[PDB]
Amino acid sequence: SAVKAARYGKDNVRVYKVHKDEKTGVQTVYEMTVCVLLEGEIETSYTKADNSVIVATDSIKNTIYITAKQNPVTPPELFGSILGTHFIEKYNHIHAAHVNIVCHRWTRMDIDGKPHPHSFIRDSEEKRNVQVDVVEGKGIDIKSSLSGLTVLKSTNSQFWGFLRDEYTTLKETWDRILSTDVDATWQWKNFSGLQEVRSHVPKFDATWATAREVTLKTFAEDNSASVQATMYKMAEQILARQQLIETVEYSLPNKHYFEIDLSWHKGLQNTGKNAEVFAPQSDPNGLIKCTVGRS
Amino acid sequence: SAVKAARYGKDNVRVYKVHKDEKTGVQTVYEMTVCVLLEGEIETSYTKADNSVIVATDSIKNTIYITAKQNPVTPPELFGSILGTHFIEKYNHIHAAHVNIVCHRWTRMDIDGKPHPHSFIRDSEEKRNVQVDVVEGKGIDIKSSLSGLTVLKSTNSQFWGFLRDEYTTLKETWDRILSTDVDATWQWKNFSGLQEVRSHVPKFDATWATAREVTLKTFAEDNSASVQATMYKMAEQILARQQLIETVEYSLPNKHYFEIDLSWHKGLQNTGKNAEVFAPQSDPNGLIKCTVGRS
Amino acid sequence: SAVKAARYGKDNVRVYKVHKDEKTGVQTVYEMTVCVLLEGEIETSYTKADNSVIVATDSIKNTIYITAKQNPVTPPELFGSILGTHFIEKYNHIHAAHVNIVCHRWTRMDIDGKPHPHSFIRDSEEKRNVQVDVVEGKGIDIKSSLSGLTVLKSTNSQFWGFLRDEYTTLKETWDRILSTDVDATWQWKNFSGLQEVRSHVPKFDATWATAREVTLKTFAEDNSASVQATMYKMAEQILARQQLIETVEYSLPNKHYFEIDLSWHKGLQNTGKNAEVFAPQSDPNGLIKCTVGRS
Amino acid sequence: SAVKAARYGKDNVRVYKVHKDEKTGVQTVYEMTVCVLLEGEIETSYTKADNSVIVATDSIKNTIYITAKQNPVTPPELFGSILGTHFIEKYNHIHAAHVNIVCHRWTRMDIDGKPHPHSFIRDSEEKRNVQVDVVEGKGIDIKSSLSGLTVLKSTNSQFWGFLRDEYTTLKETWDRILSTDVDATWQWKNFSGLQEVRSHVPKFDATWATAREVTLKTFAEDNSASVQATMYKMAEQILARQQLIETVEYSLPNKHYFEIDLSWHKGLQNTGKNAEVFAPQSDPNGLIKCTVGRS
Ligand SMILES: O=c1[nH]c(=O)c2nn[nH]c2[nH]1
Ligand SMILES: O=c1[nH]c(=O)c2nn[nH]c2[nH]1
Ligand SMILES: O=c1[nH]c(=O)c2nn[nH]c2[nH]1
Ligand SMILES: O=c1[nH]c(=O)c2nn[nH]c2[nH]1
Ligand code: NA
Ligand code: NA
Numbered sequence A, B, C, D: 001s002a003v004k005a006a007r008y009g010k011d012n013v014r015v016y017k018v019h020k021d022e023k024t025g026v027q028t029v030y031e032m033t034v035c036v037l038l039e040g041e042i043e044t045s046y047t048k049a050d051n052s053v054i055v056a057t058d059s060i061k062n063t064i065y066i067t068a069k070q071n072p073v074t075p076p077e078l079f080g081s082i083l084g085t086h087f088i089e090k091y092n093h094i095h096a097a098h099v100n101i102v103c104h105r106w107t108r109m110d111i112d113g114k115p116h117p118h119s120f121i122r123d124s125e126e127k128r129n130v131q132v133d134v135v136e137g138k139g140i141d142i143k144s145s146l147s148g149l150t151v152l153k154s155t156n157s158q159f160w161g162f163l164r165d166e167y168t169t170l171k172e173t174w175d176r177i178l179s180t181d182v183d184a185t186w187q188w189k190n191f192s193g194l195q196e197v198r199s200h201v202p203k204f205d206a207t208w209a210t211a212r213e214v215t216l217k218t219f220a221e222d223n224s225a226s227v228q229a230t231m232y233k234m235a236e237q238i239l240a241r242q243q244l245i246e247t248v249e250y251s252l253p254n255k256h257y258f259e260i261d262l263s264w265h266k267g268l269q270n271t272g273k274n275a276e277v278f279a280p281q282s283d284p285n286g287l288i289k290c291t292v293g294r295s
């Protein structure tokens, strides 16, 4: 036998950073969970008990904190690029660094109608993420995403005209609830290195904002023919509004809300146009995916 | 042996309800998770296999949906009171109904600066809850709460002057991070029945709003001497602003953020006034509780 | 306003301890999660920013580790008693210590038919717990429990003869699946102090073993008339087999498995005596409780 | 823009099946969570609101239950192959079916030293899984795995000789705790279709058993130089004992247990050879991966 693939590092590194404005007194906080996995000429640590090739995962942890101290942690695309570049430049035998960052929300509080200088609220478990792959000789590959964006619309969702055969019991509908947890990823053009990533820094926050806005507006406004049709409209718009993105991926659960027939009880009408009370279904769920690129 | 206590019913009943405005077209959604447990002359179901005294938990589930169809589900204090009253009035041998409701957030979306008539976002896993205990001959006892309100302030928290002995290693501080998940409960004066609960209906949403506002403003603005001192200020204000509340309870974790000494690496200064990067601690956590009443 | 109740301390303290046998080489591991909350003359920490009365939660954490180093951590009833007694004896103004311990499973591995001296497996997330309340002048109150014991029987469960009215749709059955997560608590006679707790130490492991054995055998062998009837049989047996227990409490979810009618598809028969494939329901669930004492 | 990739179906389908032995009365239960995602000529459902190409996810759910009724659900490799083959054979425009199965443990109870005919216990949240990819023209690709196997050894783990530089603070050790959650995958040789999968059916349970046994014995017995070195030994053995496997993948967290220096308290010695009480760390964790193939 032989090693065909190997990567290792530190997962679940929680990181907080505060920025304190000298002039205004305004403080801004950032909180992340970071994973860094390394590849390189490390197979002998597996096959020969050769630990000399291992940058200790504990050291990778130290390096995450040191890099956060000495560099911006925002946008996460930049921080991940800096972090990944460090490992492949510092260690001759390390040839790839894979950096995953989950950003947690700390939204500035409004108190009596005014923004507070140092108090924050976790307004939802929605995350902003990056996957940054820094590979020697292949530049920097960045996937940006938002996830855990949970939404519901109470009407203007339809699903009819699907295939019907002997396995089919689902009734066609022209008015249903649609609810999902949005997981949306945009994949950037390859960057040649840190200089090029830095040259595009404003685009990262801007494109995240675009992706989120397009998602919410399209969800709210599309009289949806299916999850498939709606998610495609989101993707196509995002591609049209940032040329440095090559693809957009959506993964959407269809979190079903079932009508409840109550007519067995005193002829109570609670279906169709009379449907008011529904049973949210924890499982199973439709799962719909696509990757959209340029034609 | 003998039955000393018994209660039973249905837990984790997910409920959605939509209200559709005939005139404006605006839709409003409500989503809850409901538990109803009953007490009464039911001990023989345990001791003698006498199922004749059991209102099936499946029937309790049906009743939750039927009651939601025929009554307002908002405020949850009212819905719980109606639900609990139903069981003790309908069944001669049922003498108490214990109703727990967890309300999930579905906040109306703003699209292009305008509120959308039928699209919603889960803006955080913060919950609004009630515990409604309807007991024959003892009226209706309601505990209202908010929970999972997660907040952080980056300065203006202190902790010094605590007891120091041979078990103590904690250094005094005049500037630390304070973060918590707020669990706050206000206990209403006993209500004599549904008429009295209904007579106070506007107060339930209003007092929830007060509790939340006081929590956020006090957290943000108090130069905190301790979690103990700050949570007491919250409680005292809430009691002063709603006379129909008898007690306020807080349960607050102190979700620690530790400084990281990096001076071992190139003399990097990251402690005290130089502290920028911190290690959020998943565990353990301080846990601070109090119940505040009127003097 | 005034403080009506207050308690505070450290939650979620993870603790591991290893015992190494000098003579045999056999090692034994223990892992727990500990919470200690204190009460006493501490109200001024809430009302007057008086931290002088606060034994820091950080110090409580230190004390948990120190006590584990200097004392047995098994049985958890003993460790909790020692821990709680420490706080009320050490601190004049602390009058109660509330100690919760969750014990995690590390079962010795069998390798090639022989027990291994230092390798362990988490064989299930079933927990063994204690709640130990040490109150000055009121001795030591111990509640022992097992929880997260998940079981299923595929037949020999019935449920018929329950109340039927206009809210009822549940069909009577003489053969159903029964599955639950067992939460069972036995409450000990009050102990006067550490000497009396220590005098009964062998009974704690023995009674836990009895409770578990009775639970499993009764579940497996009872042709169950209801969850109510079966859980009562468990309790009554436990009380009969340990006289130092005053009450037994069970809390049992009925984790429903629904038949699936497939007759719409090629007349497939999958109900009643033909039922083979079922839909496990995540929610809702029946929830059945009782506390059984001596007659 | 254009669809570059698309797949959709039903996730989180919970399935129970009971087998009842006519002659012995012995019952055997199986419980799974199933996901089926389909690919094919379905892009117009995304681009043109063409639902005619969609086999409804609800219908996929029905099909899972019907297939479980009419076929063995064990071994999961077989069930997944049957399920996947159904979709690509039944639907001309569906060209791939991706089937994920998570198998849940229901281990037969032993009561009074004898196996019980119809009562079961969830002995751990360890799972047995398969990923079965059935692609028209490319046969059946099966990945089998075990996951959530949580283990700990209290000694005979070492980690020294790793790279040391200005980012390193980790001390070398010749005696530490090692704990992990095992995720192990074995990838089968491509199968040409159902006939070939069926021809190897006994090998699936046998190879799962081998993988588990090798994992546990190697973990217990290897005086470990690193997670890397130990996991490689596991893989190499598995490959040597089943020739129809092409690769073995391990993903192992290093779930750290930290020594606690208590010497600040009365000179208490709890480090090095005196280490008894440890602090289990929830995060961060080392994460070590490799894929091993034949040389
Ligand atoms: O939007 C939907 N897409 C689907 O593929 C589907 N299948 N059942 N319901 C559905 N809804
Ligand atoms: O606010 C605090 N209260 C406490 O009781 C405590 N103990 N350690 N740190 C603390 N902070
Ligand atoms: O055992 C049961 N007890 C109950 O109270 C009940 N209600 N529905 N099904 C039930 N099963
Ligand atoms: O087994 C280990 N492998 C590693 O790569 C490592 N890094 N820190 N500790 C470690 N232990
Ligand atoms: Na390199
Ligand atoms: Na009554």
Ligand code: NA
Residues within 6 Å of the ligand: C087, C088, C089, C090, C091, C092, C093, C094, C095, C136
């Ligand atoms: Na005392």
Ligand code: NA
Residues within 6 Å of the ligand: D087, D088, D089, D090, D091, D092, D093, D094, D095, D136
């Ligand atoms: Na096909």
